[PDB]
Write a protein that binds this ligand. Structure first.
Ligand SMILES: *[C@@H]1O[C@H](CO)[C@@H](O)[C@H](O)[C@H]1NC(C)=O
Ligand SMILES: *[C@@H]1O[C@H](CO)[C@@H](O)[C@H](O)[C@H]1NC(C)=O
Lengths: 52, 439, 439
């Protein structure tokens, strides 16, 4: 997995393949129910959702 | 401006700073960090390299008992073995029969392989911070390596900058650190004179050219068995072979923040931590009045399409009817969206395309296009691609971002909530008036 | 066998220790600290040497004007004065008179004294300790230097000298230190680049070989007097012209606790503060059996004159009954009184005569006379000496100090004089029985 800072992987003498985390986060909608705490399930999962 | 800002300590992020000089032409400038060089205290303590178990030539006292010659040698050891037998080409090396004794001695010294290859027990603390920086000012990509501590002022084409100091003074180095030809390790090497035998670091001299070696190698000279002429001993634990077996977790690869090491002298390279203040100076020579700047009328920014992401996360067309011709700036005022190209040209009744990036879903945008403040609204998109190499710090937001409709759902649900305390106040005033009117 | 002691950190005062293995006759040995030299770890920030103001032969542009070239020199300065009057041996120098202008230039660079005569602003750091120790090893003085950190083990003549730690932690130096050629000064210089004219930092260079000379002179030129073929410049006071004459009290003189400074390299010697432990292990080659000693009996101490002083506090006679001839130890059971005699050869049933030294008003104490016990008493007298050139940690005390007989004067006045309050206490039960005199 990737943290928020990202991972730099390194393989042999070759280049350190850094990765920066893509914030893709697309499993939500707006709809007739809420689906915006679904956005907050994507962005910051499991925290800032206990607050509501 | 004497514009002193604090840019985040990120190598390769174009910081777009705003110069709205008072009643002057607006001017957006680019900066880009290129190196973060941190160099700690160069305090070499002592050395450790290979030794040499020095065995001198044995001393066979033929028909006689040799006695111990005390020689002040490191790990000196001597013993005269009694009842030996020597032999050579033509039988016995001695005419003597059974009173053949044989003196035998050995010791330890430094090795000559410490000519260039050795290990440096070494001390280090607070680094001398220096950094590389390229400023794009009006098509001028000037660059400068300055001391990142707030002491080294530098002017280039009259543009004045005092850089630094460093905000987070975090250090990846211990005091007692040992140095190999490309590496450094945080490890308590044993102190001088008080070193442990057989451990990596028993061999201890002060400078690499110093030969005064304290070492404990434990040469217990064995007896050569029967008639064979050699000098067996208790075996010598060579620390310097398995010094290199415990390279392992290299400080190049164990540093946080993506820090890089490069020894001799020891560079803590590119710490992605904190931020950095910087003074920004230029005179009014590139600054005409706001009316002498081309004043934009008919201003309208509109986002046709945006997928808010680490790429070019959006684009917007601005239609305008400016006053006149001029290379004038463009500054996004809302901090998430940042303008990709700091200054544009304007002529009058025209329109042009800007590109930018953010992460707000319902993106609000406000811009200083060199005369005027123009608002844009948007509904951008979260990305669907997966691999992005490079960061995007400008897209990032805090813990509070707007919804698309759920602000209204909040003040629908956190809307009428004091109606219950309103009728509770009704309860309180009716109980007060009946309790007081009756008593 | 093993013998760990913590002697006080005293430069140049001996220490007697009662070394003894379990089972044999005791011994008293002398050790002595000679020097505690604290070497600070260093780094040069930048240096300062004398500058040199250099002019060209200036340009006498007769009949016209020729503008100079805007070169980049440390305090480059240029001015083409107008209407000048060049003069030489045959009257005026140029036949053209009125349209004579004169370019003039001036700059400042290093001087030639910077090869060996220059001060240096250093960044000082943590200090490294070093110590000197001479032990009178049974009538044999042997001396060795070490680190006084608990971390420097040396062994020679069966003396496993390992010190304990520097119990203090204080260094007499701040990072901002300057040094010139015989001395150092702890003041805050301006850093490199950010120097001030007419001070430290009037001219700034990192190394003498570093050619970045941060200069601050403001040598503004003037029109010459009347046709005079020369260039006048303005005021520029320096630092070398003033502060070398008023650096004043070097850190040799500013030193607390009696520190001393010493260059090449600079180091803080001989402020013995704190308490230094030493662990020393000695085998049974020194200890001899108590049957090889005489059993001293019927000891009685008689002090004809004691005087609580810094020097030889008193003299005593020990009536002793040694059983035979033999060498044995004498050691008082308190640290306050110090017999100057350590290992005494005794012969029989007679009176030996020794000295001692304390500042106790009456030295009442006990001495292990070679595994036998004597109790000693000495009415000491007021010290008639006045000034002493050496300090006296042998006669030193704490605060729990004992008088001649004034503690018995207290015992007179505290055989409690509050026993009348005990009379008041014993009538408590009778007044309570008056309360009980009915019921
Ligand atoms: C100038 O710098 C910017 C950002 O630092 C970079 O994108 C651009 O390619 C540079 N141009 C030249 C000519 O170096
Ligand atoms: C040995 O040292 C003691 C004190 O440590 C000193 O008084 C004495 O003179 C020294 N003797 C010799 C022979 O060095």
């Amino acid at each position: 997995t990737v943290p928020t800072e990202g991972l730099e992987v390194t393989w042999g003498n070759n280049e350190p393949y850094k990765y920066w985390p893509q914030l893709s986060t697309n499993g939500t909608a707006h709809g007739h129910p809420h689906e915006i705490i679904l956005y907050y399930y994507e962005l910051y999962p499991t925290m800032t959702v206990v607050v509501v | 401006y004497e514009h002193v800002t604090v840019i985040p300590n990120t190598v390769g992020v174009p910081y777009k700073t705003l110069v709205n000089r008072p009643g002057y032409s607006p001017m957006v400038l680019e900066m880009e960090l290129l190196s973060v060089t941190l160099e700690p205290t160069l305090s070499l303590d002592y050395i450790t390299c290979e030794y040499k178990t020095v065995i001198p030539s044995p001393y066979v006292k033929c028909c006689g008992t040799a006695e111990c010659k005390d020689k002040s040698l490191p790990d000196y050891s001597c013993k005269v073995f009694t009842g030996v037998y020597p032999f050579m080409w033509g039988g016995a090396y001695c005419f003597c029969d059974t009173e053949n004794t044989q003196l035998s001695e050995a010791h330890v010294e430094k090795s000559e392989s410490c000519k260039t290859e050795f290990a440096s027990a070494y001390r280090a603390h607070t680094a001398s911070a220096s950094a590389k920086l390229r400023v794009l000012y009006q098509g001028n990509n000037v660059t400068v390596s300055a001391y990142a501590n707030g002491d080294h002022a530098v002017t280039v084409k009259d543009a004045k900058f005092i850089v630094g100091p460093m905000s987070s003074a975090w250090t990846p180095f211990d005091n007692k650190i040992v140095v190999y030809k490309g590496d450094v390790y945080n490890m308590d090497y044993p102190p001088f004179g008080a070193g442990r035998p057989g451990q990596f670091g028993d061999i201890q001299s002060r400078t690499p050219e110093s030969e005064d070696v304290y070492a404990n190698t434990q040469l217990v000279l064995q007896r050569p068995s029967a008639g064979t002429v050699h000098v067996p001993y208790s075996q010598a634990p060579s620390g310097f072979k398995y010094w290199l077996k415990e390279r392992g977790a290299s400080l190049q690869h164990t540093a946080p923040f993506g820090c890089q090491i490069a020894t001799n002298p020891v560079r803590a390279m590119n710490c992605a931590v904190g931020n950095m203040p910087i003074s920004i100076d230029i005179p009014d020579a590139a600054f005409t009045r706001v009316v002498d700047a081309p004043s934009l009328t008919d201003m309208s920014c509109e986002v046709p399409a945006c997928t808010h992401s680490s790429d070019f996360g959006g684009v917007a067309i601005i239609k305008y009817a400016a006053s006149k011709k001029g290379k004038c700036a463009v500054h996004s005022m809302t901090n998430a969206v940042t303008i990709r190209e700091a200054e544009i040209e304007v002529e009058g009744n025209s329109q042009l395309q800007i590109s930018f990036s953010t992460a707000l879903a319902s993106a609000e945008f406000r811009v200083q296009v060199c005369s005027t403040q123009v608002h844009c609204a948007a509904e951008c998109h979260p990305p669907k691609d997966h691999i992005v190499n490079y960061p995007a710090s400008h897209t990032t937001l805090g813990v509070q971002d707007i919804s698309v409709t759920a602000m209204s759902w909040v003040q629908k649900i956190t809307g009428g909530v004091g109606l219950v305390v309103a009728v509770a106040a009704l309860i309180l005033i009716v109980v007060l008036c009946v309790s007081f009117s009756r008593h």
